Amino acid sequence: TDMLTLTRYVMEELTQLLNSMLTAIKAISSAVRKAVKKLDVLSNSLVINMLQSSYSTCVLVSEENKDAIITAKEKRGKYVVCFDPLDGSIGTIFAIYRSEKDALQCGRNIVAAGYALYGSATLVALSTGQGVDLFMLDPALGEFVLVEKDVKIKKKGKIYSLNEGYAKYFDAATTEYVQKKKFPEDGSAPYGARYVGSMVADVHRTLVYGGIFLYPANQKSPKGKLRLLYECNPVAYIIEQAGGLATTGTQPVLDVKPEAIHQRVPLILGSPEDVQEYLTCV
Amino acid sequence: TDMLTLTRYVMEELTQLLNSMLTAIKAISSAVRKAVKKLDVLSNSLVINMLQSSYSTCVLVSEENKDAIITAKEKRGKYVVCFDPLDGSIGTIFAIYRSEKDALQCGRNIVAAGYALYGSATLVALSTGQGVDLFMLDPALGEFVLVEKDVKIKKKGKIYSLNEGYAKYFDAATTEYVQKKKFPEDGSAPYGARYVGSMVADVHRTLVYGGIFLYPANQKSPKGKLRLLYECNPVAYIIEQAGGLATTGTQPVLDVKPEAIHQRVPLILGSPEDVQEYLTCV
Amino acid sequence: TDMLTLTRYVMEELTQLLNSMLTAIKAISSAVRKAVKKLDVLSNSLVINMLQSSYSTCVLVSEENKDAIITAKEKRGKYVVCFDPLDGSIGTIFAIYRSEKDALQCGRNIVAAGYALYGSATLVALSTGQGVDLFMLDPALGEFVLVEKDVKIKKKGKIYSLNEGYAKYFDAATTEYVQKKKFPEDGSAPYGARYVGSMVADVHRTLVYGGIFLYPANQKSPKGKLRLLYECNPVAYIIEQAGGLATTGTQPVLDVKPEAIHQRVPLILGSPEDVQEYLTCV
Amino acid sequence: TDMLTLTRYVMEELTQLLNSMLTAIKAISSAVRKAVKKLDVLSNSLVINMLQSSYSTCVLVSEENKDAIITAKEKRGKYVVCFDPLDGSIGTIFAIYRSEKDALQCGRNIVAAGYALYGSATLVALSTGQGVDLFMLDPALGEFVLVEKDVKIKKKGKIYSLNEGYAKYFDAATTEYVQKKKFPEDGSAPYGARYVGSMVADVHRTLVYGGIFLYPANQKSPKGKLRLLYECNPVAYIIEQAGGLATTGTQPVLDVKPEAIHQRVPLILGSPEDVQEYLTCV
């Protein structure tokens, strides 16, 4: 008909905080569309200033800052935000929790988390613990429009995603799992391989098409590469809320007790039957 | 919250036709934003081709074409469209009706009519005979979003709009009416005067703020300037559906029987009490 | 060809200041496109914060603030900016000069001035004392693109622009001048009348099509309505740099010595031969 | 400064043809931003109609059409266009040449070729045989802006790109080459692996970061997957003009004599030293 009506949507102080996080994403999206270190600096300040100005925060941890950032008394609220303002088709990642101690909570304590993916469209996956909703940025309105409710990942997919150039450094389980995806012993076709090299792009594909994404421990990086607070926990939260699994290989990512704010952990996530099969290799 | 849902909206074959008219407006809006005779030519062809391709039309009259345009048999449908593809902050104007004879219907036979105004926002006023709805073009979606339902004009306003530089050519009623707006005899303040010089901008302001718009008969143009089929009838239809009045000075515009497709008529329209007061001067 | 190259353009610390003023206009333009008092508040803070952050300013006067705003020592620079952040198809207006005393300079001391007009396109007229250049905002780039260099106004035009609804309050010169535009004594056609009611829209039309714009003294407002620092002086500067004239009726606007920061003055401006003819009526 | 000037750019009837190809890309870009088979159909018709309307074409081959499309006599011109209107972060690919026989020319006869990549930005790589120029679509202007002239690929890169899930079907050379990238025998670090799964995204990364992209012959597809006329030849032309190599494994892609318009061929391309090392494995 070419005609629409619009209706305010609410994820069922946290609202003001998400509002401001989305407002930062909107600004980050416009800066990316018109573009390296400068963008990182700009992204970081947009997020820090909007979150603080929300009057909902007390502690932030940023990928870009050595130490946690304590919100001034006047603007102080009850929430803790861990985020990676520009990661990597690049992205932004964040997790929200209710001192530094307050950002070192297990992922299981997350109250909301999300990621933004800056592609031909800017997409946000968001969850407040009642499932995952996908939104697309409408930059003419400056508003995020709901495109899919309660997104669920496939039980089992047919794509595996990891840097296979690190083969010589793989741990035994990874070597075994990859061998199984290429040479299935049960008569089935081999999995296809995809790896963009930007974690949010790879995680997003994993959510919408199914399969598995891995950045496991290896010989060079025995604790993995990806960061527990503001990369692994938020995507583990999103993927679990969509019915998938996320493991370090030895325990669920959301169960790891953080020991420092820039701690790294291995990450294997995706369709639950693919992750379970990885775990059997471990 | 920064989040919205979208819902398809329907004005309560005509739907396909409005869809295509809106699709032409969308294209015209993009060409205007990036900009004289070339634009006129482009606008006209966008409208003619989209309307024909709708499979809903049989006869078009365009401000830009000497003769009526007969839709090819294959694409033929039941509707007649009279339009001014680029008029004038400029606009597009159209009226829809169910040979040339078929475009020479009294305005009272209109089944749908509308105008688009290309400003900081592109706005469309549309009516299918159940009131006026206002929409704003969202160019990121390529969709028109409902911004106001069942728009009503004020009973009496406080603005009068006409080219007062034609004073020496005014007919007696116009001279008298303008004198009354400047020198009220009842102790009230004088009306303010506004005149953009683009009819859709002036009509739109008249709808949303109230008052009166005039392009009456004068000494130079005893039949007025504005065109009955595709300027005066469509705006008369919109203003009447919003509770205003539109007269030639001697009869309602929608009652004039057209005698040619580019016939001109005088136009006085707006808040009903302002138009009635004009009529008493006649 | 559909292909272009881009080249940085410079008007021949002032550069950083214009950069920031343009960055505020860009933000104001986006807020207007997606829309009353809230917008005013938002516009004002965008301008104040960007200008201060430029490190080029020491004193600002805003239409929206009772008292002048003194830049903090750390961010202090050599320039004074008087502006109307949202005036009124609405606009933004500013003048730059090199305590309050420092914003009370005669318009003749202006070092740069400009206006932005938020229409189907966002247009900026800018001058740094070497003529007027017109730019259009490209919001995809976030950059202002030069569309016309060294804009000149016609010697004499054929449009007059003023609220003729104030006729009963006109001073004698205005009554006489308007009578001459409607009833020329020399056999010529009467001028056309246009008046949008938003000063930047009316001034802009006056620049590009020629003629005259008036907000003179009247019985209700013996000092006019429009504000000397941040409305009349900047547009007088732009129109003079384009070869027109701007008078209060008794002296050039740029020669008036300001006696307070929100002082009003009469404004008559435009094509020089039209303004000179107004002056003879005085 | 926030100010720019624009200047028309020309790649040094072919111009009208590129103009129309770019105009189709512009339309395809807008349809992708607002989004599967429907888009394919829409893309195809946009390209076919714009190219024909250019008055420069006589024969088109489309990925989407079984048979070549012969331009009507009235609109006929001297050029032949082979294109894939929507391939796959997806893309459009085209090659231009000066009956069906006329689209079955060796890639060496190409007079212009290009691809568009629809990401956060819409990018076009274009060459008319004097090197590769990269453009970004400015959708506010509707114009492609030059962002890099005479783009050159690295002599040797450090990324290899192929679906390693097809390992069980690899031919011996591919197995050997991949083994060398993972287990270098010369003490160097292993290459990183990247594979988006959309050929234009993978080719574009290969151009700008260097390394190698492979869709070789395998057991399932002994002639490869990718199509010679409108996928392999155009990207081979672009990569060769940037100083890289493109081979089937047994001969340069641009030297293959086409035997049918939807013929497939193997494709290995990229940095010349990486491609040469692949060839030694063959």
Numbering used by the authors:
A (entry chain A), B (entry chain A), C (entry chain A), D (entry chain A): 8 to 19, 29 to 51, 70 to 122, 131 to 140, 148 to 331
What does the paper say about this structure?
Fructose-1,6-bisphosphatase (FBPase; EC 3.1.3.11), which catalyzes the hydrolysis of fructose 1,6-bisphosphate to fructose 6-phosphate and inorganic phosphate, is a key enzyme of gluconeogenesis and glyconeogenesis and, more generally, of the control of energy metabolism and glucose homeostasis. Unlike liver FBPase, the muscle isoform, encoded by FBP2, is expressed in all vertebrate cells, both in glyconeogenic cells (e.g. muscle fibres) as well as in cells such as neurons which are not supposed to synthesize glycogen from carbohydrate precursors. Mammalian muscle FBPase is about 100 times more susceptible to the allosteric inhibitors AMP and NAD+ and about 1000 times more sensitive to inhibition by Ca2+ than the liver isozyme, and it has been hypothesized that it may be catalytically active only upon association with the muscle isoform of aldolase.
In the present study, we report the first crystal structure of muscle FBPase in its active R state. The most important finding of this study is the observation that muscle FBPase adopts a unique, cross-like quaternary arrangement of its subunits in the active R state, in which the upper dimer is rotated by nearly −90° with respect to the lower dimer. Thus, whereas the quaternary structure of the inactive T form of muscle FBPase closely resembles the corresponding conformation of the liver isozyme, the cruciform R state of muscle FBPase is dramatically different from the planar arrangement observed for the active liver homotetramer. Based on the structural data, it might be hypothesized that a crucial role in the stabilization of the R state is played by the residues forming the leucine lock between subunits C1 and C3 (and between C2 and C4). This unique hydrophobic nucleus consisting of six leucine side chains (Leu11, Leu13 and Leu190 from each subunit) is disrupted in the T state, which emphasizes the role of hydrophobic interactions across the tetramer in the stabilization of the R form of the enzyme. Even more importantly, the leucine lock motif between subunits C1 and C3 encages a tandem of Asp187 residues from the interacting subunits, which are paired by a strong hydrogen bond, after at least partial (hemi) protonation, to additionally stabilize the R form. In the muscle-specific R state, the only interactions between the upper and the lower dimers are formed between subunits C1 and C3 (and also between C2 and C4). One of the consequences of such a cruciform structure of the muscle FBPase R form is the exposure of new solvent-accessible surfaces, which in the T state were involved in the formation of intersubunit interfaces between the lower and upper dimers. The R state of muscle FBPase, which shows the highest sensitivity to thermal denaturation, has the least compact structure and the largest solvent-accessible surface.
